[PDB]
Amino acid sequence: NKNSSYFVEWIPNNVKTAVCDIPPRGLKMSATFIGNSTAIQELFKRISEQFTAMFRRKAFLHWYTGEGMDEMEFTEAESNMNDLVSEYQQYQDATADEQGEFEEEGEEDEA
Amino acid sequence: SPGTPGSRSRTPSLPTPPTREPKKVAVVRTPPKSPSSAKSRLQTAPVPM
Fold first, then answer.
1. How far apart are CA A37 and CA A91, in angstroms?
2. Residues from chain A contacting residue B21 (CB–CB below 8 Å)
3. Pick from A18, A53, A88, B15: most CB atoms within 10 A?
4. Nearest chain B Cα distance for residue A110, angstroms
5. Domain spanning A40-94 has what CATH number?
6. Do the beta carbons of residue A5 and residue A95 sit within 8 Å?
7. Residue A75: its chain B contacts at CB < 8 A?
8. b/e code A62-74 from CB counts within 10 Å (16+ = b)
9. Is the CB of residue A29 less than 8 Å away from at least one CB of chain B?
10. Is A73 on the interface with B (CB under 8 A)?
11. How far is A92 from A36, CA to CA, in rounded Å?
């Protein structure tokens, strides 16, 4: 109710609870949280950008290939980290909708 | 190296025909009716004069 926009709307109801009867050591009660927000897209968008800030200039790269790598291995993995940002882009700001797109009944009035 | 490899499908597209609507919604006709029959009935004399 207080935060309705900060749920994804195609996941109507979003919470999974567990209750153990026992606290940890300390105070009478505590609660652990685990979140899955598209917000973390701002973790990957940073590292891909700082990868790009090393990769063209090739700085340090000789030590990675040196132990064993080809340049293709970096190039599929940064591309991976771009594909994952596009998964969050697919799954951010999308709506509550039906199985597939569909066309409505129009205006046809000509007579 | 090119970062999008050749190992990957590159199937080129086709002439797909035009799109028909999802639903017809053609007009309906009302079904027919005749009136309800009485079930409990009027009866004649079983006995004469």
1. 10
2. 103, 105
3. A88
4. 18
5. 1.10.287.600
6. no
7. 1, 3
8. eeeeeeeeeeeeb
9. no
10. no
11. 12
- Name the residue in chain A with its Cα closest to that of B21: A103
Measured distance CA(A76)–CA(A78) in Å, rounded: 6
The encoded tokens of residue B14 equal 């086709």
Method used to determine the 3D structure: cryo-EM
Token digits of residue B40:
């409990």
Could you tell me the resolution of this structure in angstroms? 4.1
Query: Rounded to whole angstroms, how far apart are CA atoms A76 and A54?
Result: 16
| CB atoms A75 and B3 under 8 Å | yes
CA neighbor of B24 nearest in space, from A110, A109, A103: A103
Assigned token pair, A106: 């129009």
Helices marked H in B1-49: none
Give the angle subtended at the CA of B10 by the CAs of B5 and B11, to the nearest 5°. Answer: 165
Say if CB A55 and CB A74 are below 8 A apart: yes
Residue A35 to residue B15: CA distance in whole angstroms:
46
CB-CB under 8 Å, B22 with A75: no
Show the tokens assigned to A83: 């594909």
